[PDB]
Amino acid sequence: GSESADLRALAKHLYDSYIKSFPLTKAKARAILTGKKSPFVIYDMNSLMMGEDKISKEVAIRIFQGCQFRSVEAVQEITEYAKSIPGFVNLDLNDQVTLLKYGVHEIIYTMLASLMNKDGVLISEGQGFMTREFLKSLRKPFGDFMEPKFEFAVKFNALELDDSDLAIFIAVIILSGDRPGLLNVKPIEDIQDNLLQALELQLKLNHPESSQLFAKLLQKMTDLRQIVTEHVQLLQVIKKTETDMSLHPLLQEIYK
Amino acid sequence: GPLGSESADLRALAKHLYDSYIKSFPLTKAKARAILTGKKSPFVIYDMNSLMMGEDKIKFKHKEVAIRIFQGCQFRSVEAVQEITEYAKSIPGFVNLDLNDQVTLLKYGVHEIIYTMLASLMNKDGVLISEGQGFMTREFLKSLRKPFGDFMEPKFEFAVKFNALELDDSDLAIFIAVIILSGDRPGLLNVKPIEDIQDNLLQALELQLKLNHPESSQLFAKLLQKMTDLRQIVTEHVQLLQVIKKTETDHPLLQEIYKD
Incomplete structure (x- = not known):
C-alpha cells in the first residue's frame, strides 16, 4: 500500500x-545521558569492581560475557519487533x-549507538556508563570490540534520528532480500x-531541513555490514586466544 | 530562486557528467x-586453446595461462585508473x-568504480575484453x-544483479561520481567539503x-544498497591480491608500475 496515508499509518504502527x-x-x-539517579560511571578496574557491586574471573572476559547476555535479550526484543x-x-x-539470523547484529549496533556518545556507552538498562577510554x-x-563502534555511533548520531525514524530504519534492515540462503526473495523485497x-x-516530514537524509541513512547500511564483519572477525580471534567460554544457545545458532 | 530552477541545475549537472x-x-x-547481443563480432575465448589463438587475433600489449590473464588484467586496470582520474576532474x-x-579519494575509489563499470561489459556468460574486440567466457575464467x-566469479555474480537494475550511461555517470566523492575514505583531511x-x-x-526510470520503485535506494555490496567485492578482491602477493611469488620497474 503506497498512498501517503498508508505510509504514514505504517510509520505510526512501527x-x-x-x-x-x-x-x-x-x-x-x-534523557539518562544528558542528566534530565545518575548512572554509575565505570572508567577503570576499581570502578568496574565497585560497579559490579553497586549495580569468568578475568576482566576483559567478564565484560564480554555481560555483552553476550545483553545481546541475547536484544535478539529477543528484535524478534518480537520483527513479528x-x-x-x-x-x-x-x-x-x-534467515532474516533474523543475518539482521539482528546490524540492528544491535544501530540501537547501541542510541546509548552511546563520544565518551562512552550506557549499560545495564541505563544504570551504568562505561567509558570509551576504559574499553x-x-x-x-x-x-578492539568497541572502538570502531564508537566511531560509527558518533557519525550516526550526527544524523539526529529519533525513535520514530529508527523504528522504520530497523524494519528496512530486517527485510533485506540479499541475506544468504533466502528461498523467496521477491516477497521480502516488496x-x-x-x-x-x-x-x-x-x-522528509520529520527532518524537512536535512538534505539527503534518506540517502545518508542508507549509506550507514555500509558502515553496519562492515561493523558486523569486524564483530565476526573478533569472535574468531576469541576462539583462538581464549579457553572454554560458554555461549548462549541463541548466539551459537546466529554465529553458525 | 525561481520555480523549476533547482531541478534545472540538477539536470544540467547530470548532463555535464x-x-x-x-x-x-x-x-x-x-x-x-550492442556487442553482447551477438550479431564486427568479437573473438570468443572459451578455453585454453582459443585463448592461445586469441593472442594471435587480438594483439595484447601486456607462461602459465592463469597468470598471463591476471597480468593482462593488471595492465587494463592501470589503464582504467587513468580514465577514472580524468573523469574525476x-x-x-x-x-x-x-x-x-x-x-586519497581516487586511491580508495577506483576499484569500486572499475567493478561497477566492468558490469557494463558483462552478461551472465562472459565479459568483453580489449576494447570490445574479445569476449572471454565466465566458464573459462x-x-x-x-x-x-575465483577472481572473476564474484564479479559476475554482482554484475548480473547490478545489470538487472538496467541503468544506462547517464545514470552510471552520476553514480560513479557519487562513489568518488565518498567522505568515509581513510586519511581524508577535510571530510565536510567532500560530503557537501x-x-x-x-x-x-x-x-x-526518478525521471529516467519512473516505473522503478525506489531505484535510488536500491542503487545505494549496491553501493554497499561493491565494498564487499572490493574487500574480497583485496584479500585475493594479498594471497597472490605472498603465495604466488612465481621485474622491479614492472612491480613499480603495478604497486596498486
Whole structure:
C-alpha cells in the first residue's frame, strides 16, 4: 500500500510496536545521558569492581560475557519487533529465521549507538556508563570490540534520528532480500520497497531541513555490514586466544 | 530562486557528467550491450586453446595461462585508473579539494568504480575484453586453477544483479561520481567539503533515476544498497591480491608500475 496515508499509518504502527518491544528507547537513553539517579560511571578496574557491586574471573572476559547476555535479550526484543512488521510472519518460515539470523547484529549496533556518545556507552538498562577510554584500555582483542563502534555511533548520531525514524530504519534492515540462503526473495523485497517509501516520507516530514537524509541513512547500511564483519572477525580471534567460554544457545545458532 | 530552477541545475549537472563520462570512457554501456547481443563480432575465448589463438587475433600489449590473464588484467586496470582520474576532474568541486584528499579519494575509489563499470561489459556468460574486440567466457575464467578461478566469479555474480537494475550511461555517470566523492575514505583531511559535493551529486542522481526510470520503485535506494555490496567485492578482491602477493611469488620497474 503506497498512498501517503498508508505510509504514514505504517510509520505510526512501527513506532508503536518499537516502543512496545524495546524498553530502553533513544529518548530514554538520551534523557539518562544528558542528566534530565545518575548512572554509575565505570572508567577503570576499581570502578568496574565497585560497579559490579553497586549495580569468568578475568576482566576483559567478564565484560564480554555481560555483552553476550545483553545481546541475547536484544535478539529477543528484535524478534518480537520483527513479528510486528506487516508481512513478516507470512513469509516462508525458513526465510523468517534467515532474516533474523543475518539482521539482528546490524540492528544491535544501530540501537547501541542510541546509548552511546563520544565518551562512552550506557549499560545495564541505563544504570551504568562505561567509558570509551576504559574499553580502549582493554587487552587485545577485547580492547578492539568497541572502538570502531564508537566511531560509527558518533557519525550516526550526527544524523539526529529519533525513535520514530529508527523504528522504520530497523524494519528496512530486517527485510533485506540479499541475506544468504533466502528461498523467496521477491516477497521480502516488496515489503522492503514499501518500508523504504515509508522511511523516505518519514524523514522528509520529520527532518524537512536535512538534505539527503534518506540517502545518508542508507549509506550507514555500509558502515553496519562492515561493523558486523569486524564483530565476526573478533569472535574468531576469541576462539583462538581464549579457553572454554560458554555461549548462549541463541548466539551459537546466529554465529553458525 | 525561481520555480523549476533547482531541478534545472540538477539536470544540467547530470548532463555535464554524462558528456564528461562519454569523453573519458571510450567503450560505453550502450556500445557494449550492442556487442553482447551477438550479431564486427568479437573473438570468443572459451578455453585454453582459443585463448592461445586469441593472442594471435587480438594483439595484447601486456607462461602459465592463469597468470598471463591476471597480468593482462593488471595492465587494463592501470589503464582504467587513468580514465577514472580524468573523469574525476570534471566532477564539479573535485579539483578544488585538498590535493592530498583528491589522491586519497581516487586511491580508495577506483576499484569500486572499475567493478561497477566492468558490469557494463558483462552478461551472465562472459565479459568483453580489449576494447570490445574479445569476449572471454565466465566458464573459462571459472576453470582457471585456484586462486585465479575465483577472481572473476564474484564479479559476475554482482554484475548480473547490478545489470538487472538496467541503468544506462547517464545514470552510471552520476553514480560513479557519487562513489568518488565518498567522505568515509581513510586519511581524508577535510571530510565536510567532500560530503557537501556528494550531497549535490546524490540529489542529481535521485532526480535522474526518478525521471529516467519512473516505473522503478525506489531505484535510488536500491542503487545505494549496491553501493554497499561493491565494498564487499572490493574487500574480497583485496584479500585475493594479498594471497597472490605472498603465495604466488612465481621485474622491479614492472612491480613499480603495478604497486596498486
